[model samples]
Target: GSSGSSGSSHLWEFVRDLLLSPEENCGILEWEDREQGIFRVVKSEALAKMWGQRKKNDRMTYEKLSRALRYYYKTGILERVDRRLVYKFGKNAHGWQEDKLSGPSSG
Candidate 1:
């Protein structure tokens, strides 16, 4: 069977969007090392709940999420780290940068 969505609303995208909104969500996740794009999942169960509902995926759980995240490692979307619940965005991951305030394209 085919997937529900196409080229949009990926897990990585949802993760990035959540990271971009820290206090708004009451710190469900956080940037352990923002400079290196390293983030820590403070509440895995909470994340599972949020992510599951966000995509209208009723059966989503941390276990399933774990599998999906492992797949991301193979796809170069997230780099594996030794620490628990900690993840670093891989080279292929984009739009997580906090420094890009604006672009005038004057040139």
Candidate 2:
């Protein structure tokens, strides 16, 4: 006998959560230009603190974070500008202006 046609509720729940999370939920910067896709890694001590507070010694969580960063790089959402600096695309370029660099209203 054929079972009654039914949709899985679990699928709907998963889709709902996925749609709700913003594209930059983890603070990964999005780029503005297509060819020059790049992103900067802002200081995120909160993540480190959370990792330190975990009672379980499992390294999977840390691994997951590393994986996320790798994925960002793979997707062209993140890029290392230098040995100690990273840059993100889609951010306001005007913010780069310093007092020594033509003031803050260049853009």
Candidate 3:
């Protein structure tokens, strides 16, 4: 079953929401390149714990959560970054942009 296959929020969306709501994340994650849709997990285990709480799991570890994160690459939700703990949103990613008016230009 895919994380984004149903009504439940996808991991990428969750990450995006966190980045969008910095007050909630409390510095656990940071946007390395906002215009480019790149971010880094500043606090991996802590963020994983938050994700665990969101998913109703008390025993979530970054090791396990990263596996799920990696899965997004195959699904076009994320781009693989060679840098450790850093990730980029792929073309399939939506709703995380500061500017949402991406329709065809009248010009």
Best by TM-score: 3
Q: Which candidate do you rate higher for lDDT, 2 or 3?
A: 3
Q: C-alpha displacement of 39 in model 1, angstroms?
A: 0.4
Q: Worst 10-residue stretch by lDDT in candidate 3? A: 1-10
In model 3, which runs have C-alpha deviations exceeding 4 angstroms?
A: 1-6, 98-107
Give the least accurate 10-residue stretch of model 2, judged by summed lDDT.
10-19
lDDT of 3 at 41: 95
The predicted structure with the larger TM-score, 1 or 2, is 1
- Selected candidate, larger TM-score, 1 vs 3: 3
Query: How many clashes does the backbone of model 1 have?
Result: 0
RMSD to native for every prediction? Answer: 6.9, 14.4, 5.7
Model 2, CA-based lDDT? 0.35
> What tens digits encode model 2's per-residue C-alpha lDDT throughout 9-91?
22112211222344523542233333443333243443333433443334434334445444544554344354332444322
Each model's lDDT? 0.81, 0.35, 0.85
Best by lDDT: 3
Ranking by lDDT: 3, 1, 2
Ranking by TM-score: 3, 1, 2
- Per-residue alpha-carbon lDDT of model 3 for 1-107, expressed as tens digits? 55755567667888788999977888888889988899999999888898888798898989988887889899888999999899999878887655765678776
Quote each prediction's TM-score. Answer: 0.79, 0.26, 0.82
